[PDB]
Amino acid sequence: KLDRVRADYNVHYWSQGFYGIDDQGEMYVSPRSDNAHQIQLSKIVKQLEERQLNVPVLVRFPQILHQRVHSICDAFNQAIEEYQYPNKYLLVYPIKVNQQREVVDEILASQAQLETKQLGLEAGSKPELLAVLAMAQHASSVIVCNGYKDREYIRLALIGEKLGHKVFIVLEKMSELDLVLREAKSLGVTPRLGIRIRLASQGAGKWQASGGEKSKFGLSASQVLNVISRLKKENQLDTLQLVHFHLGSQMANIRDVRNGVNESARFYCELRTLGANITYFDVGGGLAIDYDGTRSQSSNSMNYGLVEYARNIVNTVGDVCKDYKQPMPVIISESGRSLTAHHAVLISNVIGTETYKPETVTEPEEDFPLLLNNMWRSWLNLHNGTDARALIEIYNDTQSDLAEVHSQFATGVLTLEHRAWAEQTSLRIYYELNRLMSTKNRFHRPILDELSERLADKFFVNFSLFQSLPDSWGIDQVFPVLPLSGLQNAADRRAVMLDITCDSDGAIDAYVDGQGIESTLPVPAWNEDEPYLMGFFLVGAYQEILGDMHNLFGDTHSVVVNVGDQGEINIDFINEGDTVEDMMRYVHIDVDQIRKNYHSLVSQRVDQEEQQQILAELEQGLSGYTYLED
């Protein structure tokens, strides 16, 4: 049954209604706001294959970016209406989360459909500013500038203001103020200034600009005061328009958001008190994504929802302004991750497995030692008539017996054959223990968890973790991962997913299912005869940019898919992934020379009939996708 499978995965806890399992047992995406047509992801794959693109593939749904833009804006609007807050919310997209022109254009495109009709982007570095200015060349835009600012970064930012953008240069180091004033004078521009504030409510040391605590940016209380003082002196206090703080990405605890906003709102009111007219209050990033579906205060989740995040921000800022009797600023959030995580799915195939097949326990030959007979006797006592206690005993004896076998092999007591026999016999006992024990028995359940790991299939997935999913390796980030098809049989097996790199770390340690994080995943059985497709979801934020070429596996193919009015699958942009030859160039091999040398060597050492064949396979290997063929 599919509907019992649906409760085993509980996709809806993490998918936000963008993905689900349909009645044919296929995973779909539903990316349109009218929710009009669902599309089976496997059917998108079938259509890529027709066009000669093989998996792995990264698939983007812009229609999902559009909805996130509207949801985040809707959430703050609701909060504004409920509080009767007397100013606006502005969404601003930090490009660091995902810089791809096709992501950023779709984000810009919905922002234009919004009532403010207000474009907002944030750059965190010189190269990002130039990218941001390129991508907002068409219309006047809010641009917030963060990061380390040299002369050239400041002059480019002022050039942007000259050319008609609203460019906020956020002061993050005290020396930058003096640089901005000089460069603005030199370009004849009226600069717009924001200030980044250091907070004392988020940990020891962060209030301090100097010192060995690692928050890089932001001005001290003292430094903030110096800014106001320097501006008053130059008759430029009106250029300070923006107050900024950034708590960090993926804030799991709503309390920290509240404490942060509380402290910042007070700074904002104190600055107006000293005469500055701050128009904007920018709460930075930090709006988390619920990667594991558990809504918990854990590093892969959050204990709050979208609207509640909005309310904590609006209410706190509003309450602090009412106390000071100050007017309320435009609220900005830089919510990159929330905007981008859901829109992308990585698809690839399971190209082989290592699974345990139950074989027959052969009886001990006269040659076998007591220890191995003991295991044989355990195997005979294991059946439907073995009681609940005695099954546990047999588990414990069998583990101890295998451990002793391993020690005797290591010291020269036992032959390779003895070891083999004991290992296969143990696996047979484990396999049966796993069938005889009951999940309704309280003392069997912990063992059945143990046994579930011990008997899981290894699934080798045609992809590189280091390339497509770097946070998995680097910070034990969890992503939901699921078979795309045949989900009626998801109770068949348990499996762990490994990548095809020659590295221990290219394996997933954690899975998302119906009750949260597990160490293995329930899956349909694999067959050599049918394609078996898997999906990594919530890969939309920070994954693409951060991946690297371990083992010379390169970029995957990527495509943009829009679902049309009548349910068409419009494949709108297509980016081809790396070939082996690309990777060879990247590491400075002269490939044209390699090809030509190959012509010689083959004519030298190969029989004439074969030569064309051998040369074709060499040339073809160079020109192939880095990834493997089933």
Ligand X SMILES: *Cc1c(COP(=O)(O)O)cnc(C)c1O
Residue 307, number of CB atoms within 10 A of its CB:
15
* Residue 13 engages a copy of itself in binding (rule: CB under 8 A): no
Query: Which 89-108 residues touch ligand X, going by CB under 6 A?
Result: 94, 96-97
Binding site partner of 553, from ligand N=C(N)NCCCCN, ligand X, a copy of itself, none, Cβ cut-off 5-8 A by kind: a copy of itself
Instruction: Tell me the CA distances in angstroms from 149 to 169, 249, 448, one per residue in order.
Output: 9, 22, 57
Instruction: Tell me the CA distances in angstroms from 52 to 48, 49, 158, 574, one per residue in order.
Output: 6, 5, 47, 12
* Residue 115 engages a copy of itself in binding (rule: CB under 8 A): no
Nearer to a copy of itself, 330 or 606 (CB): 606
Contact partners, residue 617, CB within 8 Å, separation at least 6: none
* Residue 501 engages ligand X in binding (rule: CB under 6 A): no
CA distance 62 to 60: 6
> DSSP string covering 420-434, please?
HHHHHHHHHHHHHHH
By CB under 6 A, how many residues form the interface with ligand N=C(N)NCCCCN? 7
In the complex, what is the shortest distance from the CB of residue 325 to ligand X, in angstroms, rounded to a whole number? Answer: 30
Among 77, 202, 249, 378, binds ligand X (CB under 6 A): 249
Tell whether 197 is in a known binding site: no
Q: Which residues pair with 561 in a beta bridge?
A: 571
Give the 3-state secondary structure of residue 256: helix
In the complex, what is the shortest distance from the CB of residue 295 to ligand X, in angstroms, rounded to a whole number? Answer: 17
Q: Which two tokens stand for residue 577?
A: 């992934």
| SS3 per-residue string spanning 341-403 | HHHEEEEEEEEEEECCCCCCCCCCCCCCCHHHHHHHHHHHCCCCCCCHHHHHHHHHHHHHHHH
Query: Which 257-316 residues touch ligand X, going by CB under 6 A?
Result: 284-287
* Residue 621 engages a copy of itself in binding (rule: CB under 8 A): yes
Nearer to ligand X, 309 or 463 (CB): 309
Site map (CB under 6 A) of ligand N=C(N)NCCCCN, residues 234-273, x = contact? --------------xx------------------------
Site map (CB under 8 A) of a copy of itself, residues 507-526, x = contact? x-x---------xx------
Task: Name the nearest CA neighbour of 288 among 306, 270, 261.
Answer: 306
Rg (CA), the chain: 30
Q: How far is CA 214 from the centre of its chain?
A: 24
* Residue 397 engages a copy of itself in binding (rule: CB under 8 A): no
Check: CB of residue 279 under 8 Å from CB of residue 327: no
* Residue 575 engages a copy of itself in binding (rule: CB under 8 A): yes
Tell whether 319 is in a known binding site: no
Q: Which two tokens stand for residue 573?
A: 């942009």
Nearer to a copy of itself, 274 or 388 (CB): 274
Contact partners, residue 410, CB within 8 Å, separation at least 6: none
* Residue 351 engages a copy of itself in binding (rule: CB under 8 A): yes
Query: Which 150-179 residues touch a copy of itself, going by CB under 8 A?
Result: 150-153, 155-156, 159, 162-164, 173-175
Tell whether 412 is in a known binding site: no
Nearer to ligand N=C(N)NCCCCN, 299 or 575 (CB): 299
Query: Which 432-471 residues touch ligand X, going by CB under 6 A?
Result: none
Give the 3-state secondary structure of residue 312: helix
In the complex, what is the shortest distance from the CB of residue 494 to ligand N=C(N)NCCCCN, in angstroms, rounded to a whole number? Answer: 25
Task: Name the nearest CA neighbour of 484 among 529, 528, 532, 516.
Answer: 532
Angle between helix 221-233 and helix 254-273 axes, rounded to 10 deg: 30
Nearer to ligand X, 287 or 521 (CB): 287
* Residue 214 engages ligand N=C(N)NCCCCN in binding (rule: CB under 6 A): no
Tell me which residues touch ligand X (CB under 6 A).
94, 96-97, 122, 124, 146, 246, 249, 284-287, 334-337, 502
- Annotated binding site for substrate, which residues? 281-291
- Annotated binding site, which residues? 281-291
Tell me which residues touch ligand N=C(N)NCCCCN (CB under 6 A).
248-249, 471, 503-505, 542
